[PDB]
Structure 1
Amino acid sequence: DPTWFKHAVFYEVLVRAFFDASADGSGDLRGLIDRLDYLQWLGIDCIWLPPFYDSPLRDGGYDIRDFYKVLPEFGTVDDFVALVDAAHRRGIRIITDLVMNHTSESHPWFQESRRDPDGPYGDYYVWSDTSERYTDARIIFVDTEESNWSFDPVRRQFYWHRFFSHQPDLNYDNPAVQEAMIDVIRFWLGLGIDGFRLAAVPYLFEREGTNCENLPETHAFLKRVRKVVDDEFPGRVLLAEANQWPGDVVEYFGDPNTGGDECHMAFHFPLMPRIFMAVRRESRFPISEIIAQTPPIPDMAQWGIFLRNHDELTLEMVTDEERDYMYAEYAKDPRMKANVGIRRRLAPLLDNDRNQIELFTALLLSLPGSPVLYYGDEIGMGDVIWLGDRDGVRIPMQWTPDRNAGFSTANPGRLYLPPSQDPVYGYQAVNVEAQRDTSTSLLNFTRTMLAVRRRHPAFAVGAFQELGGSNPSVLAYVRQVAGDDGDTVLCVNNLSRFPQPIELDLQQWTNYTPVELTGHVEFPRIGQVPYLLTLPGHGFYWFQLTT
């Protein structure tokens, strides 16, 4: 089969908050095989499932306690196979997250470790006295944790946790830990899962003096894992994560000369915190510059464009000291979660204003790379920030407006979370049964946009070239495919509230007719004088530029 990660849109279907198929007030794998038709109807080809393993849910389940067993709440591991079989016989791809760099303080490998120095599971985790080692590494959570080392009583030594107080980072130097964190990678691929993500890759190895992140030793292990995947089972997308400066530190794609020997796909973290900056700043540079700075990429790796995920809009080092602008713009009513992010969903971030919403949908549907959509955001939900942790972005999705937002058929007290009841973004104001009918509802509009993004095999294997006109508050680009008689396209996105005039310079494509895509309204021929256009506030076009 083809590369299939160049042409695809990913969905973040949290196994929780989607559907309760047994009245347990929580998600369920067998509860997703019954709503695996809303996805196909929506036109989504690859599904992405965050981890669901045996893990006391102290932090969104990223506290694995066993990498060999499905959490009993979310059905057995004989229901994951059913989900895979049902999502393969319908034309959908599912990738399951795999997280390294930690383990909950309950895995036998840790309890039997702190209680048994010199035992086999003795040096798996990082144990070393003193609070001076790696004294230059930054601290991520500037709210809960404040030491990054902590103190373990039973052994009285220290331990190395990079994320929380109950997540001891594994010491990968021990050449036996990198045979039990790789035997998992060689097991789930045996179930037929098509590719698996890698989470928190930059923080694996840490050595003194350096910054402790993205050391030139993680990449050796990544190359080893990629070679293992290639030799054992070909054709899987080892999606990755960077959240680093664009530079050369985000490129985990391997040596360009070979073409690819590492992660097949990254995430556009450098650009995610700048789309909003550009949109509110009424300009296009905060996006054009960021797309220009990033170096080139190999010929067999996509770029993973996206807007929001199950995190809090990580406004970290990725952004320079202009964070003081986004704090004062998107973070009034203090809700700064740590020094990173704003902890708000897409729709609330934009005053629920529809125009900005479809503008951003177009921007993530056209810019270089495949899009990834959070399970909501196609209805206009979110908010409910006041809950503990960053759990204002994991409320159950709001289907039909019956009791408990049609999530399940149990008591409204047994639900693991209460469906929102905001006067605006409530479960009685933004539904799925109240939007699948109206032909201009946001769900249907995004479905249409997806529909017109599959009839041009030029949005996924194309190119990028910013044309630019006199007006600085609007950008344009041409996703032209390669070869003779290219499947050229055009895009002209506004970035201001009002309507503006644009003087494009498409003379390089002279003798071309800009056939529209919304309604096939043949526009004026591409003359030689400055091409002229006039757009409304937050408006956009998707031309075709045919001969």
Structure 2
Amino acid sequence: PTDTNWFKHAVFYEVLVRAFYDSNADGIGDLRGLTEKLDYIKWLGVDCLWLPPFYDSPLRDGGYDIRDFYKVLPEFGTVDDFVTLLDAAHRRGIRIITDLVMNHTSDQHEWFQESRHNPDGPYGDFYVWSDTSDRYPDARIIFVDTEESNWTFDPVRRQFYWHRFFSHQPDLNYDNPAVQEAMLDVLRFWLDLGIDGFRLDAVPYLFEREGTNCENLPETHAFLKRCRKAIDDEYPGRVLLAEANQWPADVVAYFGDPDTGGDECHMAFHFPLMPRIFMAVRRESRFPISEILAQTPPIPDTAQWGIFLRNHDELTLEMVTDEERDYMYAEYAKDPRMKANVGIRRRLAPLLENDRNQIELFTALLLSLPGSPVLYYGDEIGMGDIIWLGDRDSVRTPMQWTPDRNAGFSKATPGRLYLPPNQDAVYGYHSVNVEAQLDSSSSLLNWTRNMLAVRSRHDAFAVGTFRELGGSNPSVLAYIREVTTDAVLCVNNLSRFPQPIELNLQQWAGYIPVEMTGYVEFPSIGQLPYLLTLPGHGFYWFQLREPD
């Protein structure tokens, strides 16, 4: 049932098929397992699942190296299990989007094997081949510590092929019109199955051109317009999300032509948000947050920013920044917490040293700042990570359902699990798990669920305007979200100590602030500045109720 704005009102939940629930005791999470846990997901109150790549893959780069776009990784199930999942989610009002890597395939993909073995055949030009490694010299090597070059010599074809990512991930040749059609057909295949949309990954790198750094080319945007057009024409109500790990000013291009109301991606991610919030709290100053928001350009009214509490892009493990436009550019390296975690994904609780007050503060900001928020699976119970598993796999350990064997994720033997659960005294499944948190109304899980329920009752959080209120105290960030008569006031203390703030709310004189969890009515707003007092790292949400 089409609702062309659903993505603006959605809370997304990024969940890995491999990690959520193993229904068949092979030690690996699967589609049937995820289907069996949909009642939990509905109960939590999220609106759309975001599944990282689950296609057939040799898994040398986390499944971002795809061997077959048309096939589910066999240990997850088949496309039939995927449709079962889709139907069960839809039946509960939950949508599903997935990652789709557009720039490159695994070298195990049959297209590449045909390209190298049969250069004269129909796949001969499906990839970017050269007698020399000299072309495109201005393109940086993304994985500079691992790849000596963006060109690799193939021993079968005896020419170099191009890859922006690892050598086992050859780039598709988008100047070949058969490649463009083949990739459009991949989109249609999953859309026909009923998927609600895609996050398109690595799209800034589609086209290469001499004289350029081979990112963000106009031909790249042109292909994205084809994708959007195919969606608009054939599957209305579906969504395209861009993964462009760039400064927000540069990302706005990915929404497309403003005069059209946006003709490329419906959404794109605002990557610098979490690094700025993290630094605002470290510095006890609202300015890193105020500034990043104020400097973010307007986007088409059809579009929406995606936001999440992570410091790194999951594809490249890089944190966005900009020498010229980021006033905090040199500051990140001066923070020992940021410095220790460079290039490693970490979960929310570990990022905040398990401080429950800060977890709540960061989560409140995620749920009230402009954009559609993405929650990462397990953050709602305060799961930890295991950094030694890898820069990405750190945060991909099994969902911790119960304090039972394997955290209740699987009936297999522990040695057969795809990755082990946390076992330490702080984050281990004996103390951190869904079951333990279900009872108390004061658990992080129940708190998170309640915050989602509150957010869902106020359209202002999803699509409202954003007005930062300033105020006497630079340690406090206060703002109003407004839709036109749903008006909400959010006040956030970035300081570890109690703070007073006096706000000029004269425009809303007469209005009565009603705090959104206890529904207590606060003193009516007058002509004098309104005094609010917050504990360290505290926050309040108020509905601004019109007078009688």
- 1:489 corresponds to 2:488: yes
Report if aligned partners of 1:382, 1:395 keep a CA contact under 8 Å in 2: no
Report the Cα distance in structure 1 between the residues aligned to 2:191 and 2:9, rounded to whole angstroms: 22
Equivalent residue, structure 1, for 2:66: 64
- TM-score with structure 2 setting the length: 0.95
Aligned to 1:315: 319
* Cα distance in 1 between the residues matched to 2:252 and 2:172: 23
- Cα distance in 2 for partners of 1:56, 1:87 equals 28
Structure 2 residue identity aligned to 1:503? E
Work out whether residues 322 and 329 of structure 2, in 8 Å CA contact, stay in contact via their aligned partners in 1.
no
Report the Cα distance in structure 2 between the residues aligned to 1:540 and 1:58, rounded to whole angstroms: 43
Q: Say if 1:264 and 1:249 are closer, same or farther in 2 by CA, change over 3 A.
A: closer
Please, which moves more after superposition, 533-542 or 325-334? 325-334
Cα distance in 1 for partners of 2:338, 2:306 equals 30
SS in structure 2 opposite 1:545?
Answer: strand
Q: 1:487 to 1:292 in 2, by over 3 A?
A: same
- Identify if the C-alpha distance between structure 1 residues 446 and 50 changes in structure 2 by more than 3 Å, giving closer, same or farther: same
- Give 2:423's aligned residue: 421
| Whole-Å separation in 2 of the counterparts to 1:121 and 1:429 | 53
2:509 is matched with: 510
Q: Deviations over 1:384-437 (max 9, x none)?
A: 111234311111111101112111001111111111212211111211111111
Partner of 1:13: 15
Give the aligned length: 540
Identity over aligned pairs, percent:
82
- In the alignment, structure 1 residue 499 sits paired with structure 2 residue 472: no
Task: Give the secondary-structure state (helix, strand or coil) at the position aligned to 2:253.
Answer: coil
Aligned equivalents of 2:509, 2:321: Cα separation in 1: 44
Question: What is aligned with 1:329?
Answer: 335
The superposition leaves residues 41-61 of structure 1 with CA deviations (integer Å, 9 ceiling, x where unpaired) of 111111111221111111111
Spell out, residue by residue over 1:488-543, the C-alpha distance to the aligned partner (whole angstroms, 9 max, x if none): 11001110100111011111111211121121111111111221111110111111
2:542 matched to which residue of 1? 543
Counterpart residue number, 2:525:
526
Partner of 1:282: 284
**Number of the residue aligned with 2:444:** 442
Provide the residue aligned with 1:100 in structure 2. 102
Report the secondary structure of 1:228's partner residue: helix
Aligned counterparts of 1:244 and 1:210: Cα–Cα separation in 2 = 17
Look up the SS of the partner of 2:197 in the other structure.
coil
3-state SS of paired residue (2:33):
coil
Amino acid at match of 2:425: P
Seen in structure 2, the aligned counterparts of structure 1 residues 382 and 310 have a Cα distance that, compared at 3 Å, is farther
Amino acid at match of 2:225: K
How many angstroms does 1:144 deviate by?
Answer: 2.1
1:307-346 deviations in Å (ceiling 9; x for gaps): 1388286313357484554344354785533xxxx43221
What runs of 5+ residues in structure 2 fail to find an aligned partner? none
Matching residue's letter, 1:492: V
Deviation per CA, 1:91-117: give whole Å up to 9, x if none. 110112221111001111111111122
Partner of 2:6: 4
| CA positional deviation for 1:465 | 0.7
Paired residues of 1:269 and 1:318 also in contact (CA < 8 A): no
Of 237-246 and 311-320, the range deviating more from structure 2: 311-320
TM-score normalized by structure 1? Answer: 0.95
Single out whichever of 134-143 and 512-521 deviates more from structure 2: 134-143
Alpha-carbon distance in 1 for matches of 2:36, 2:207: 42
Partner of residue 267, structure 2: 265
Q: Partners of 1:331 and 1:145 in 2: how far apart? A: 28
Quickly say closer, same or farther: Cα 1:478–1:334, change in 2 above 3 A. Answer: closer
Is the alpha carbon distance of 1:330 and 1:344 closer, same or farther for their aligned partners in structure 2, counting shifts above 3 Å? farther
2:475 counterpart letter in structure 1: S
How does 1:52-201 map onto structure 2 within 5 Å?
52-201=54-203
Where in structure 1 are there 5+ consecutive unaligned residues?
none
Distance 2:80 2:388 in 1: 37
- What CA deviation, in whole Å up to 9, does each residue of 1:415-472 have, x standing for no partner? 1111121221111121111111111000000011111111222211200011111110
Residue equivalent to 1:303: 305
Q: Could you tell me how far apart the structure 2 residues matched to 1:332 and 1:285 are?
A: 18
Q: 1:430 to 1:318 in 2, by over 3 A?
A: farther
Q: Secondary structure at the match of 1:81?
A: helix
- Cα distance in 2, alignment partners of residues 153 and 102 from structure 1: 20
Matches of 1:527 and 1:487 in 2, distance apart? Answer: 19
Q: Is the 8 A contact 1:109 1:121 kept in 2?
A: yes
C-alpha contact (below 8 Å) 2:106/2:170 kept by paired residues: yes
Q: CA deviation at 1:379?
A: 1.2
Q: Residue 368 of structure 1 corresponds to which residue in structure 2?
A: 370
Contact 1:273 1:313 (C-alpha < 8 Å) held by counterparts: no
CA contact (8 A) 1:23 1:408 kept: yes
Whether the 8 Å contact between 2:252 and 2:299 is mirrored in structure 1 is: no
Q: 2 CA distance for matches of 1:429 and 1:14?
A: 22
CA contact (8 A) 2:332 2:339 kept: no
CA distance in 2, matches of 1:413, 1:248: 46
| Native 8 Å contact 2:247 2:320 kept in 1 | no
In 1, Cα distance between the equivalents of 2:8 and 2:110?
40
Comparing both structures, which one devotes a greater share of its residues to strand? 2
Question: 2:194 is aligned with what amino acid?
Answer: G
Q: Is the 8 A contact 2:228 2:265 kept in 1?
A: yes
Letter of the structure 2 residue corresponding to residue 526 of structure 1: I
Q: Secondary structure at the match of 2:20?
A: coil
| Alpha-carbon separation, structure 2, partners of 1:212 and 1:326 | 28
SS at match of 2:38: coil
Secondary structure of 2:374's aligned partner: strand
| Distance (whole Å) between structure 2 residues aligned to residue 389 and residue 508 of structure 1 | 49
- Distance in 1 of aligned mates of 2:8 and 2:248: 21
Q: Report SS of the residue matched to 1:276.
A: helix
How large is the RMSD of aligned CA atoms in angstroms? 1.7
Q: Which range is displaced more, 136-145 or 184-193?
A: 136-145
1:402 & 1:292 partners in 2: Cα distance?
A: 48
- The whole-number CA distance in structure 1 between the counterparts of 2:514 and 2:339 is 46
- Does the CA-based 8 Å contact 1:242-1:250 persist in structure 2? no
Rate the CA distance shift 1:346–1:202 in 2: closer, same or farther, 3 A: same
